[PDB]
Structures are given as C-alpha cells and as structure tokens.
From a paper:
The structures of [name] bound to the 20-mer ADE SL and to the 22-mer [name] ADE-like SL RNAs were refined to a resolution of 3.0 and 2.2 Å, respectively. Given their highly similar binding modes we focus the following discussion on the structure of the [name] ADE-like SL RNA, as it naturally exists in the [name] 3′-[name] and was solved at higher resolution. Notably, the U-rich hexaloop in the [name] ADE-like SL RNA binds to an extended surface on the [name] domain that cannot be accessed by the CDE triloop11 and includes a few pyrimidine-specific contacts. For example, the main chain atoms of Phe255 form two hydrogen bonds with the Watson–Crick face of the U11 base. The side chain of Lys259 forms hydrogen bonds with the phosphate groups of U10 and U11 and the hydrophobic side chain of Val257 stacks with the U11 base. The RNA stem is closed by a Watson–Crick base pair (C8–G15 in the hexaloop SL RNA). Interestingly, the G9 base stacks on top of this closing base pair and takes a position that is very similar to the purine base of G12 in the CDE triloop. The G9 base does not form a base pair with A14 but rather the A14 base packs into the minor groove of the RNA duplex. This arrangement provides an extended stacking interaction of G9, U10 and Tyr250 in the [name] domain at the 5′-side of the RNA stem. The preference for U-rich hexaloops depends on nucleotide-specific interactions of [name] with U10, U11 and U13 in the [name] ADE-like SL.
The [name] protein is essential in T cells for the prevention of autoimmune disease. We have recently reported structural and functional data of the [name] [name] domain bound to a canonical constitutive decay element (CDE), a short stem loop (SL) that acts as a cis-regulatory RNA element in the 3′-untranslated regions (3′-UTRs) of target genes such as Tnf. The [name] domain adopts an extended winged helix fold that engages predominantly non-sequence-specific protein–RNA contacts and mainly recognizes the shape of the canonical Tnf CDE RNA. Here we present structural and functional evidence for a greatly expanded repertoire of RNA elements that are regulated by [name] as demonstrated with a novel U-rich hexaloop SL in the 3′-[name] of [name] bound to the [name] [name] domain.
Numbering used by the authors: 178 to 325
The structure:
RNA sequence: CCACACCGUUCUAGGUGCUGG
C-alpha cells in the first residue's frame, strides 16, 4: 500500500522506478554511456541503455527507460545542448559522473516528489523501497535532512 | 487507468496517438 501512492506520484510526473536491482543497473548504464562526456540525444541514450539492460531484465523498454531518464532530467543531472529544429543532446554534468553522486541526485528527486505529493515515508521505508534492504538508512535520512 | 510509441520539458512540463489492452 505504501508503494502504490509513491509510484503513482512518480508516474504522474513522467518518471519511473523499475525496482532496486533494475534501477541500479539502468543508472550504471547511463554512466557507461555518459561518464566520458558523450553528448547523446534522448533517443540514443535510451537505445543504449535498453539494449544492455534487456538481457538481465527482459521487461526493459524504450518507454520505461525514458521514464528513468526523465527522473534525472527532473533532478537536473544533464547539461542540455539545445539545437535548432533537431533534438537536444544531453551530457552528464561533471559532478554526477559517479554512481553515488548520480544516485544521490536520483534518490533526492523521488523524495521531493513524495514531499510534493503530501506523503510521509520514514528512512527505513525509503531504504526498503529504493534498495531492497535496510543498509541505506542513514543515506536516506541524510537526503531528507537536506531537503527539509 | 495500464502497456507500447512519438514529440516536448535545463525558460523543469507535460502532451499526442484517428496505437493496443
């Protein structure tokens, strides 16, 4: 029940959480594409991630991965180079080119959406929802403290 | 509402499907 309201608010903003293991791998594949400073269109980044993710996770799609990318878009993780007529190119901002930096920004964004939706979720519940364990308790509390 | 897909959102944001369930 505590999942349902959170994931509905996440999806209402064009975002998605695919699950602890799947979201982690998805974000690490974004790093594989963008850690070296490559400027990829949204289409190409999504095509890059989906290909590498669907062997481990068959349900991965252009649509569901696009929703993960949007979460990082909303969290301001990209340098966006707009172009006339054509589609924009996206690079990872230099400060989010490691997993823990990107993941902090990603997690913070989900917590912001939860706060904007009027939901109250404790750090232990957050650790379960985002990591499938209770070993990220202080990590989530730290994120909540900075948002408040 | 869900899925799929397209266009847009870094001036921050969602839209469109005369796609499917």
């Amino acid at each position: 029940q505590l999942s349902s309201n959170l994931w509905a608010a996440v999806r209402a903003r064009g975002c998605q959480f695919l699950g602890p293991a799947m979201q982690e791998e998805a974000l690490k594949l974004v790093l594989l594409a963008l850690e070296d400073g490559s400027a990829l269109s949204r289409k190409v980044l999504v095509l890059f991630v989906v290909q590498r993710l669907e062997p481990r996770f068959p349900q991965a799609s252009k649509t569901s991965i696009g929703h993960v990318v949007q979460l990082l878009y909303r969290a301001s993780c990209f340098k966006v180079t707009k172009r006339d007529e054509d589609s924009s190119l996206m690079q990872l901002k230099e400060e989010f080119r490691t997993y823990e930096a990107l993941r902090r920004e990603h997690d913070s964004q989900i917590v912001q959406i939860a706060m904007e939706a009027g939901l109250r979720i404790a750090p232990d519940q957050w650790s379960s929802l985002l990591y499938g364990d209770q070993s990220h308790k202080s990590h989530m509390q730290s994120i909540i403290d900075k948002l408040q």
